[PDB]
């Protein structure tokens, strides 16, 4: 969200019966009211003065920044012939530059839904067409495709593809159709389903997701399953492992500070040492407090400074000090803090190196990181393992399932 420099613009009522403007937004959507369309008439008058994407900050000196939609339309409707706007351009925040899946430029949700309907109803199901489309669309575009498909067929898209697709391909495609928060929410529910817990999957998602992502996950989890994510974590975890997971899942880690606190970096490094290697036993609450509350750039420097006081680095210290699920959680969290692309590169390698494939981890990472940092993951993977992630997917998977994953990868390295 980039707000441009403020500007004043005068608009005049037209004899057609209005200002020739269209607006969206408002305080209810927690984004300011923005100009969405300028008429043919008004554009000739306002060439270079007002633009689509301009947020309306003031109307005739009245601040409408924190006003909801109808409040703004009532002011402009109950206004005079001329109106003076204070405006500012809203350049929407860009996505990641390091994702493999980009948004298709000439995107037609109706044409995509039609082509998918044709592929689904082709005798034998045209999987290639389905994979080609959905792996070359952004997640948001797939949501538009799903809405258009349901109107066209009276059938939900994910429901249709669950019967048209089978095996691991179905798992990939159904995974791509969910929003990021829905996918993680449903993967978390799956890790806590029935008796026992897939702690590895719970650890992977909770340790790796950011504050904003965990915020949306906690909301979407409660909407889907009518229970709080924290309550299911409490019922499926125990001891200090539970406390760490509950702390992380809140998504209230300190945001990246502007200044580097070298004194706190040193004190956190010593407290981490004093709580573990330097003593008998471990002060696990101290470890949890520092590693869940401090910002990520800070902890990165804390872990390096820690090596000045400790004979072992943070990861080796964790292995020596704690065991079981608690150890595994700490090990994943520190990797995610130190180098998250490398973390995922190693988990991808682990899921393919040996007999068969841990498809659950492979599919989840290729889906969830395709629009985040897949290009960095690929870079770290080729750097460490000498062959591309593309290569390993080829040797471990086959068929349309393989082609789907290769598309989410994005190419060879």
């Amino acid at each position: 969200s980039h707000m441009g420099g403020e500007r004043t613009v005068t608009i005049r009522r037209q004899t057609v019966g209005g200002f020739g403007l269209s607006i969206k937004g408002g305080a209810e959507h927690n984004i300011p009211v923005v100009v969405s369309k300028i008429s043919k008439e008004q554009r000739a008058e306002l060439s270079g003065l007002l633009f689509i994407g301009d947020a309306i900050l003031q109307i005739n000196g009245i601040n409408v920044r924190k006003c909801r939609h109808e409040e703004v339309v009532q002011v402009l409707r109950n206004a005079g012939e001329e109106v003076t706007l204070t405006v500012s351009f809203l350049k929407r925040a860009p996505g990641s530059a390091y994702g493999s899946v980009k948004a298709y430029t000439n995107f037609d949700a109706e044409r995509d839904a039609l082509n998918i309907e044709t592929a689904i109803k082709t005798k034998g199901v045209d999987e290639v067409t389905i994979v080609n489309i959905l792996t070359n669309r952004s997640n948001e575009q797939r949501q538009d495709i799903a809405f258009a498909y349901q109107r066209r067929t009276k059938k939900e898209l994910a429901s249709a593809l669950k019967s048209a697709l089978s095996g691991h391909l179905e798992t990939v495609i159904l995974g791509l159709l969910k929003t990021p928060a829905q996918y993680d929410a449903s993967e978390l529910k799956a890790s806590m389903k029935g008796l026992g817990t897939d702690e590895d999957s719970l650890i992977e998602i909770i340790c790796s997701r950011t504050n904003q992502e965990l915020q949306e996950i906690n909301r979407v989890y409660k909407e889907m399953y009518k229970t709080d994510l924290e309550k299911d974590i409490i019922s499926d975890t125990s001891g200090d492992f539970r406390k760490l997971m509950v702390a992380l899942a809140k998504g209230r880690r300190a945001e990246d500070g502007s200044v580097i606190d070298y004194e706190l970096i040193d004190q956190d490094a010593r407290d981490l040492y004093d709580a573990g290697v330097k003593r008998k036993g471990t002060d696990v609450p101290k470890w949890i407090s520092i590693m869940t509350e401090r910002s990520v750039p800070h902890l990165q420097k804390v872990f390096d400074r820690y090596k000045s006081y400790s004979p072992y680095d943070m990861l080796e210290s964790i292995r020596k000090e704690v065991k079981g699920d608690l150890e595994n959680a700490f090990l994943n969290l520190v990797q995610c803090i130190q180098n998250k692309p490398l973390y995922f590169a190693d988990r991808l390698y682990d899921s393919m190196k040996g007999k068969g494939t841990r498809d659950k981890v492979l599919i989840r990472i290729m889906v969830s990181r395709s629009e985040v940092d897949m290009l960095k993951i690929r870079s770290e993977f080729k750097r460490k393992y000498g062959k591309s992630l593309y290569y390993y997917i080829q040797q471990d998977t086959k068929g349309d399932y393989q082609k789907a994953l290769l598309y989410l990868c994005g190419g060879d390295d």
Binding site: G18, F19, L21, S22, I23, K24, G25, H29, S36, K37, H69, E70, V73, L76, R77
Partner: peptide, 8 residues
């Protein structure tokens, strides 16, 4: 994007 759009 594609939010409620009042035209004035």
């Amino acid at each position: 994007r594609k939010l409620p759009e009042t035209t004035l």
